[PDB]
Swiss-Prot record, chain A:
This is Ryanodine receptor 1. Belongs to the ryanodine receptor (TC 1.A.3.1) family. RYR1 subfamily. The chain holds residues 728 to 775 of 5037 of the full protein. The lineage of its organism: Eukaryota, Metazoa, Chordata, Craniata, Vertebrata. Homotetramer. Can also form heterotetramers with RYR2. Identified in a complex composed of RYR1, PDE4D, PKA, FKBP1A and protein phosphatase 1 (PP1). Repeated very high-level exercise decreases interaction with PDE4D and protein phosphatase 1 (PP1). Interacts with CALM; CALM with bound calcium inhibits the RYR1 channel activity. Interacts with S100A1. Interacts with FKBP1A; this stabilizes the closed conformation of the channel. Interacts with CACNA1S; interaction with CACNA1S is important for activation of the RYR1 channel. Interacts with CACNB1. Detected in skeletal muscle (at protein level). Fast- or slow-twitch skeletal muscle. It comes from Oryctolagus cuniculus.
Swiss-Prot record, chain B:
Residues 19-107 form the PPIase FKBP-type domain. PANTHER family: PEPTIDYL-PROLYL CIS-TRANS ISOMERASE, PEPTIDYL-PROLYL CIS-TRANS ISOMERASE FKBP1B. GO terms for molecular function: calcium channel inhibitor activity; calcium channel regulator activity; FK506 binding; peptidyl-prolyl cis-trans isomerase activity; signaling receptor binding; transmembrane transporter binding. Has the potential to contribute to the immunosuppressive and toxic effects of FK506 and rapamycin. PPIases accelerate the folding of proteins. It catalyzes the cis-trans isomerization of proline imidic peptide bonds in oligopeptides. One of its GO terms (cellular component) is cytoplasm. The lineage of its organism: Eukaryota, Metazoa, Chordata, Craniata, Vertebrata. Identified in a complex composed of RYR2, FKBP1B, PKA catalytic subunit, PRKAR2A, AKAP6, and the protein phosphatases PP2A and PP1. Interacts directly with RYR2. Its main location: cytoplasm. This is Peptidyl-prolyl cis-trans isomerase FKBP1B. Transmembrane segments: none annotated.
Length: 48, 107, 49
């Protein structure tokens, strides 16, 4: 499931990647160095 | 014809030029299938000269649309590739081929 | 139809011991942030990736 974003590459040296989560509404959103990536997840069970 | 999805590191300016050798490290992959050929496991660069028309059209077309150092995810159609009857005994008929290439070629 | 063979590398993973979850109200307001650093490339160690 590729995602279009600027600076497309694998995990190069000297890079930052991160994420954020909300337990209220299921929303898993990621981000990289410089700008965020254009893709999230949602609508999943969270019973664990 | 060819729709690459390149990867950043490398020169990205020195394109191939006609009638010269092009080192590769191709690793084949069938569409919704398995690996069938590769050179990294074989440990050989697989030198070949563009222009003589010996390699498949899709591979040389994808190599034309890139430059030194950059990795890519090449895609090839059945008509461009073997897919009229297929390479006998390994590729089935009407195939759709995938490749990805790295190189340290001279020019 | 027949079986297939190929070489394959490990895939392994580790975790911080940082447990969260949506309880019935004591969920700690569901908000944390990641951060990673890598200082290498090694695109092809031996064979695959």
């Amino acid at each position: 499931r590729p995602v279009t974003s600027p600076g497309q590459h694998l995990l190069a040296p000297e890079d930052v990647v991160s994420c954020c989560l909300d337990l209220s509404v299921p929303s898993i959103s990621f981000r990289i160095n410089g700008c965020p990536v254009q893709g999230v997840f949602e609508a999943f069970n969270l019973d664990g | 014809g060819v729709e690459i999805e390149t990867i950043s590191p490398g020169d990205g300016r020195t394109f191939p030029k006609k009638g010269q050798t092009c080192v590769v490290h191709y690793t084949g992959m069938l569409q919704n299938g398995k690996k069938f050929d590769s050179s990294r496991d074989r440990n050989k660069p697989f030198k070949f000269r563009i222009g003589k028309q010996e390699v498949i059209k899709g591979f040389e077309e994808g190599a034309a649309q890139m430059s030194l150092g950059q990795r890519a995810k090449l895609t090839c159609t059945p008509d461009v590739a073997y897919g009229a009857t297929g390479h006998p005994g390994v590729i089935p008929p009407n195939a759709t081929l995938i490749f990805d290439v790295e190189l340290l070629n001279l020019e | 139809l027949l079986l297939q063979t190929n070489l394959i590398n490990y895939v392994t993973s580790i975790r911080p011991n940082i447990f969260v979850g949506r309880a019935e109200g004591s969920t700690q307001y569901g908000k944390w942030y990641f951060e990673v650093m890598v200082d290498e490339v090694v695109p092809f160690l031996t064979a695959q990736a």
